[PDB]
Task: inverse folding
């Protein structure tokens, strides 16, 4: 041999006065370095070195050439330093968004495992849902998002990799009059806390009512906050839909009961979403692997 | 001169990103929508939209115009709703954001009380924090935010009415190495999950370490989601700060312990924030009253 | 109607105490304004005005409504002011690039005519050639470019409108030994000043040599500057190619002679190039019209 | 460790914007090129290229790396060329930029003289001005620039050797209203074509108006092209400043007149500018000598 190795060796030769000593010091093959310098001299059509009783010195040509060699060796080191600095900041940070089912079950175990493997990466995690996360995924402010989406609706700009097949549960307060219901039609007159979903607030229950041949569900309120949702429901007669993970993991469990209908609800697929054109850091790859491991 | 229907059409266009998609929603012919938009553009003598691969996007002029469009449309709607309320037709919409201490304690009781008194008003609740909420207060899309803030910081066109003085605790997993610590200095070498705050992630612990003469706290990760935070802490050795309300009301209580520090921590004030010059609707004032009632 | 006219009228009514006087002052039809206010009151389901012996006053409902009306009227004026400010800066400036044949013959007459019609537009003109101008056209720093290009080679991002069919002439010093040549083959051993062209320096003469079955032309030097080219040639034995306009309009005319070969050279088409997705100001449109007028 | 051939390949890729297009130029298999690039990326542990619709583009890492790549490649080439020249093989390349006074007077004579002495060196001349030329001096793609500059301003890593002290005149059309003016104050209300200068367009006339106690000169237009400038002035009532050399040597002399002012105008110094730590090739030094000879 590599020209940069030969140039670094030439610099060392000027300093120590010996091709052989410079080879030894740099851990290069002496005959290899000798052949490499010969090849360079042939290409340049002039000798760089002249033999002395001492060892070797630079020729007039070698002194001229060395000014360039030093610039080139320094520039290569500067390039490597700059790339190291830029890469270090890139590899050193992850920012992503996560939906409640991921945030509550997969993430905590995944973050702990991840941090053992990648002790020097700063992770920035926020709540996020599709398509809200889309402009942030696209402008590059969010590296990836872990969110429910409908395969056919996802922006062409985005890659989508399935992560978890989630459950939706209908939930009300522990003593709700409809707690024993078997069919969705039995709930058709209840009032709903419309919760967040890819197609808009309440889209899941609205679409379920529609497919089961029912009128629009009655809007009680819109609660886009999953943090607030279990408590709002616990202290009202509203029904809602939520991921089963949230039903299992909230501060109001003693005050809530799911209503296990014999009518099936959808199982939203949670995806890893990101721009397809955009390179992924090793750490981001590693975190997604850990999240995948804990999402089964 | 601007036409109100066209403003609403432009907002819809922005929401969905296509002329064809918007036209469907507004029950209008594709060209009919274009006629109206072109009318607004022809007169402003400025293009508001640009054809993209994915549909239409706002030009620079369009982006600037939107904040005005939204305030005009939302104020026109609030004007109508208020008049109805003044005649005892208690219908309308209220959209507001809340912080974790409010959402978990005051809000479930307040919304239940409000709904009993004003059954026909449609309420939309979301998460939110100052200053992120400021642009939505200014354009009228958010009627108020219940959020921590520092009195002196708040922008001059906003009004801030005190709602609740919160309590901050430091929390770790139940068997944390420092579970029995009583001084902030003993935590100097611990790693932190930086939680959200008006002054930015980790601001409370950074400012507490500062005032107690300590170096910067060691960043473990940034967790902007209060929904995710307790579980993240429960399954790691990260410490965090959280509102006492969250410490008492989360899904991981049995796995968490507050550190029994005898160094005092701050007590952030939660405010009702609004754009001052906008007249509060009677319905919104009623909801704010119920929230205040339950926040004491 | 228009709601904003009705709102402005309502503001005036509060001030002057008369619907009829407010209509007269604003140059609105009295019966039209009366009907418009009635329609608004019907929509709001409350009266805004009550008759007095004096004229009219606002009702309690009208006083509440007026707070919103004033915000809406102010906001519309602010929107119009902001758009005016943004549009004014957009319409007030043009920046473009031009090739030598345009710069020397069409532009000076076109700029003078343009400036009479658009006295308040600042024009910024620079030299430019395709494809060098492409990244600047695409990022929006250059509004348009007037340059030679090959139709099939132009970026899909760009619109191209033909402006002028130019002539290429071979030029040497007045006494060049080959001044009387009739065939390109007679020049095959001459040395060339490679001049700028869309396909790279010397592309025209290299491609002409190739099509006429000749070897590569001999490179004397590369002169990318058309400003420098006529003088460099006047003081050497180099031949070059240049637009006929440059041959006719340079400081070294007395020292140069074109060599009128019977072998034809190409006639590069000069285009107006720009991003197709990007809206064009009236002034830019007007300038291009003036340039077109003077490019025939 | 970096490989020189791969750096050259990356520069070629950047020039043409496609892997396929670059591979053709370098006489290599598509995949072979990718192998080499992937080798450089795999080792840097950073992506240098991204697939776009139009081919490939440099990543942030790639853009940062390019300045280093270019200096390394161009220094390696200069090293070889210098060695050849030191053996009396006067071949190589010199690339340089020149300002209008130099290009029109000194340059035609200097290039002719240089070509007689060093017939086998390939010279590439372009227009250029400080500070626009600085990045190309730093990355080694431009060997020197002959340009006006202010001594004190010049960046510390650049060397500036004085070449010529120029003369500025104010010029208008022959029958200009102010053709017979003798004081700068008499021109206060005239409109100006702002011509290019190291401190920005119009800097000379702005700074002259300033020093003479006058208000800002009235901007008529900005004309960055000295090629276009004389014709633009000849066919309008715009005044401009230009080097006296340009006033004497342009295509519109019969239609132009210098204003016979008895207020003194500045005399900008033209310098030879280079990156100081780069060793000047013997051939470049020879060309600089001839330019100095003719600039006196
Ligand atoms: Cl959905
Ligand atoms: Cl804070
Ligand atoms: Cl070409
Ligand atoms: Cl200057």
Result:
């Amino acid at each position: 041999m590599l020209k940069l190795q030969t140039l670094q060796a030439l610099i060392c030769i000027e300093e120590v006065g010996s091709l052989r000593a410079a080879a030894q010091l740099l851990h290069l093959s002496q005959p290899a370095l000798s052949a490499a310098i010969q090849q360079l001299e042939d290409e340049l059509k002039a000798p760089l070195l002249v033999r002395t009783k001492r060892g070797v010195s630079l020729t007039s040509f070698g002194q001229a050439f060395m000014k360039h060699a030093r610039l080139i060796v320094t520039e290569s080191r500067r390039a490597q330093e700059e790339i190291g600095q830029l890469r270090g900041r890139w590899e050193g940070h992850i920012t992503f968004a996560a939906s409640p089912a991921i945030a509550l079950a997969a993430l905590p175990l995944a973050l702990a495992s991840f941090a053992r493997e990648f002790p020097d990466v700063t992770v920035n995690v926020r709540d996020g849902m599709y398509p809200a996360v889309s402009p942030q995924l696209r402008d590059g402010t969010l590296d990836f998002a872990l969110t429910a989406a409908h395969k056919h609706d996802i922006d062409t700009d985005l890659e989508a990799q399935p992560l978890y097949v989630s459950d939706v549960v209908i939930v009300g307060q522990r003593q709700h009059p409809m707690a024993n219901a078997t069919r969705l039609a039995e709930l058709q007159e209840c009032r709903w806390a419309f919760s967040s979903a890819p197609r808009g607030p309440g889209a899941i229950i609205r679409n379920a009512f529609a497919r089961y041949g029912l009128p629009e569900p009655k809007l009680g309120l819109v609660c886009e906050s999953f943090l607030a949702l279990p408590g709002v429901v616990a202290h009202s007669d509203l029904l809602t839909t939520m991921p089963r993970t949230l039903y299992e993991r909230n501060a109001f469990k003693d005050q809530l009961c799911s209503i296990p209908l014999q009518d099936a609800l959808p199982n939203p697929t949670i995806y890893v979403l990101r721009r397809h054109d955009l390179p992924v850091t090793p750490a981001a790859a590693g975190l997604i692997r850990w999240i995948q491991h804990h999402a089964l």
Q: What stands out?
A: The CA atoms of residues 197 and 204 of chain C lie 7 Å apart. Chain C touches chain D at residues 98, 100, 103-104, 107-109, 111-112, 115, 122-127, 155-156, 201, 219-228, 231-232, 234-236, 248-253 (CB under 8 Å).
